[PDB]
């Protein structure tokens, strides 16, 4: 089993995202992972990319968030979105879920899923 280049890059981006403790990484997003019971992997990732897309769209032009550490955050959030095109697809998947998580914790939850997924190439 060859190691997936896509997963590799996604993990690099997630590691970069979760090492920087920026001001606005404490803002909350919908905890889509709470709503992923009997849900496909593709849908879970689409739900996550949708939430992430909404976040970087709304907080790219955010005065409160602004001035260089926020630039890297938005940069890497957009990267993550692109990195997920192959897993999530170019799709929007809204959820009714009310549960909120900090962006930090949301990204940590996604990193865990991806790194578990990546470790399959060690089989």
Instruction: Verify binding: residue 36, another protein, rule CB under 8 A.
Output: no
> Which residue in 44, 83, 95, 101 binds another protein (CB under 8 A)?
83
Comparing CB distances to another protein, the nearer of 39 and 89 is: 89
**Phi, psi at residue 36, to the nearest 5°?**
-100, 75
Rule CB under 8 A: say whether 15 interacts with another protein: no
Quick one: 85 or 121, whose CB is closer to another protein? 85
Based on the shown chain and the rule CB under 8 A, indicate whether residue 86 belongs to the binding site for another protein: yes
**Binding piece for another protein, criterion CB under 8 A, among 4-12, 29-37, 96-104, 114-122:** 4-12
CB atoms within 10 A of CB 3: 12
Residues near another protein (CB under 8 A) are: 5-6, 8-9, 12, 75, 78, 82-83, 85-86, 89-92
């Amino acid at each position: 089993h060859k190691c997936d280049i896509t997963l590799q890059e996604i993990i690099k981006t997630l590691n970069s995202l979760t090492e920087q403790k920026t001001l606005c990484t404490e803002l909350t997003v919908t905890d889509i992972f709470a709503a992923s019971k009997n849900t496909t992997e593709k849908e879970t990732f689409c739900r996550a990319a949708t939430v992430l897309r909404q976040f970087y769209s709304h907080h790219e032009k955010d005065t409160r968030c602004l001035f260089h550490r926020h630039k890297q955050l938005i940069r890497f959030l957009k990267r993550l979105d692109r990195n997920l095109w192959g897993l999530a697809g170019l799709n929007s998947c809204p959820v009714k879920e009310a549960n909120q998580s900090t962006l930090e914790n949301f990204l940590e939850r996604l990193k865990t899923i991806m790194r578990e997924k990546y470790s399959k190439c060690s089989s």
